[PDB]
Amino acid sequence: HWGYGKHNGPEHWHKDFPIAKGERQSPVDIDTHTAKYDPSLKPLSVSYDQATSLRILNNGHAFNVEFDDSQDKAVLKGGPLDGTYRLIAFHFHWGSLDGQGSEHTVDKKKYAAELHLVHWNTKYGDFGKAVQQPDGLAVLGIFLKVGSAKPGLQKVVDVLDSIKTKGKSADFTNFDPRGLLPESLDYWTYPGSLTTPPLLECVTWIVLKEPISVSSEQVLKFRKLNFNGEGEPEELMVDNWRPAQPLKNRQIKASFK
Ligand SMILES: [Hg+2]
Ligand SMILES: [Zn+2]
Numbered sequence: 022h023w024g025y026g027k028h029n030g031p032e033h034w035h036k037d038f039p040i041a042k043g044e045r046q047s048p049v050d051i052d053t054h055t056a057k058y059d060p061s062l063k064p065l066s067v068s069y070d071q072a073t074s075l076r077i078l079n080n081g082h083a084f085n086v087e088f089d090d091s092q093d094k095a096v097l098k099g100g101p102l103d104g105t106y107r108l109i110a111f112h113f114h115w116g117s118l119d120g121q122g123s124e125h126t127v128d129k130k131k132y133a134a135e136l137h138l139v140h141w142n143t144k145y146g147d148f149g150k151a152v153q154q155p156d157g158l159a160v161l162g163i164f165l166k167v168g169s170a171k172p173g174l175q176k177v178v179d180v181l182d183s184i185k186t187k188g189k190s191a192d193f194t195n196f197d198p199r200g201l202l203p204e205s206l207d208y209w210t211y212p213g214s215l216t217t218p219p220l221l222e223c224v225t226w227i228v229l230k231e232p233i234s235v236s237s238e239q240v241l242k243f244r245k246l247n248f249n250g251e252g253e254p255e256e257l258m259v260d261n262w263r264p265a266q267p268l269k270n271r272q273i274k275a276s277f278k
Contacts (some may be wrong), residue, residue, distance in 0.1 A: 023218050024082070024248065026256075031263045038218045045222045046266040047213030048124035051273055056209055059274040065206045065227065066099035067161075069199045072108065077180055078190035081248060082217060083112040083261055086177065086193060090141070090148070095198065097140050097159055100227055100276070101210045106140035106159040109148055111198065113137070114216070115243045117259035119167045124216050124262045125228050127164075132232055133240055134165040135262070136201060137216075157223035158215075163203065168234035173200020178242045187250040203231035207277040216263045230277065 023029055023037065035041035072095035078085050087110045088095060095108035115134035116122030123132035138161040141151035151157035176196055183191045207230040214222040246258035 025261050034218060034220070038220050040214070040220050040222065043214070043220070043222055044269055045212050045214055045271060046220065047216050047224065047226060048126075048263060048265055049211065049213065049268050049271075049273070050126045050129055050265045051209050051228065053128050053275075056273045056275045058278045059276070062101055062210070062274060062276040063099050064276070065097065065208065067097055067199075067202065067206070069095045069108070069197070071095065072196075072198055074193050074196040074198075076190050077177070077184055077193040079184040079187055079246060079258075081187040081250075083114065083258070084181070084184060084246065085110050085112050086196065093143070096143075097138075097161065097227075100208065101225060101274070102159055103156070105143045107143055108138060108140050108198070111136060111138045111201075113165070113243065114262040115165075115240065115259065116262065117244065117257075119237070119240070121260070122262060123164055124265075125162055125164075125226075126265055132164040133167050133235070134243070136163040136165060136233075137161070138163070138198065138201075152221050152223050154223055155212075156225060158221075159225045159227060160215075162226060162228040163201065164229070164232035165240070166232045166234050167237055167240060170236035170239055171201070171233055173197070174235055174239055178239050181242050181246060185245070186247045186253075189251075201233065203229055203233045205229070205231045207231065207275075209273050209275050211271055211273040213271075 073089040123135040145151040248256040
């Protein structure tokens with residue numbers, strides 16, 4: 022099926038998912054000089070204090086840390102959002118080298134990686150129905166730059182060995198996602214889509230201005246994961262990011278000046 026290789030990469034996705042050439046595709050380049058400062062944008066409210074992580078899984082294109090979303094345990098609200106959005110999972114996109122890896126770019130600048138915390142609008146009952154609505158999802162995007170180590174990320178880094186190949190999973194409880202947030206919650210927001218097939222256009226993107234730094238050693242661990250399943254030729258999981266898409270008729274708003 023789809024992937025990030027020469028023969029099944031982002032350029033080929035449109036054949037199986039025509040929406041790839043849609044009107045509100047992600048990611049996009051964030052031009053800081055044309056972004057519109059919107060003073061009506063309220064601050065973000067991140068309530069992750071009762072978060073309950075369950076397991077981590079290598080799905081062939083990234084690794085997913087899944088959470089229990091049967092109750093308002095870890096929620097996002099405020100900002101450009103109407104209603105409460107529940108955290109269901111998070112994953113990253115990274116590169117083969119420190120100079121690439123993020124999906125969104127800021128004034129064309131690429132970061133080493135990008136964290137996506139996926140949430141769904143509780144008004145819709147479950148994730149499956151949320152993806153049928155234009156305001157069904159809210160994804161918090163956080164940039165990662167190489168520098169000092171992020172203590173709160175080591176727990177994830179350490180378990181990667183047990184889920185090296187596609188299909189493997191491991192129990193991953195008591196992980197606190199608050200350890201992955203930057204100091205400031207200033208952000209840019211725009212209407213977009215999931216960046217991997219089915220590329221559904223139900224996402225309200227909230228990209229934080231301030232990146233978090235991780236050590237070279239931490240990011241190196243990501244690059245040791247495999248795309249392939251066990252007993253198959255080794256294909257390192259690197260460059261699992263989609264290039265910027267045309268903004269078309271959309272305006273990116275900023276919560277800061
Ligand atoms: Hg949708
Ligand atoms: Zn993503």
